[PDB]
Amino acid sequence: LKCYQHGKVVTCHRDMKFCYHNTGMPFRNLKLILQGCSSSCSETENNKCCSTDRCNK
């Protein structure tokens, strides 16, 4: 029960059960990487969804 929330494999909150690797959101200053966890992820093309610890390498 953990993922990359702050660049460090840590246990998220809000009772997260799925990890997502959002690459959308075109914002400079970063390599388009919006990794975060959520209770109900929305598996999409830009926003994928995982279900394992350390899934979002």
Domains of the chain: 1-57 (2.10.60.10)
Q: Are strands 18-22 and 9-10 parallel, antiparallel or unpaired?
A: unpaired
Task: Dump the DSSP string for 1-57.
Answer: --EESSSSEE--STT--EEEEE--S--TTSSS-EEEEESS----SSB----STT---
**Structure-determination technique:** NMR
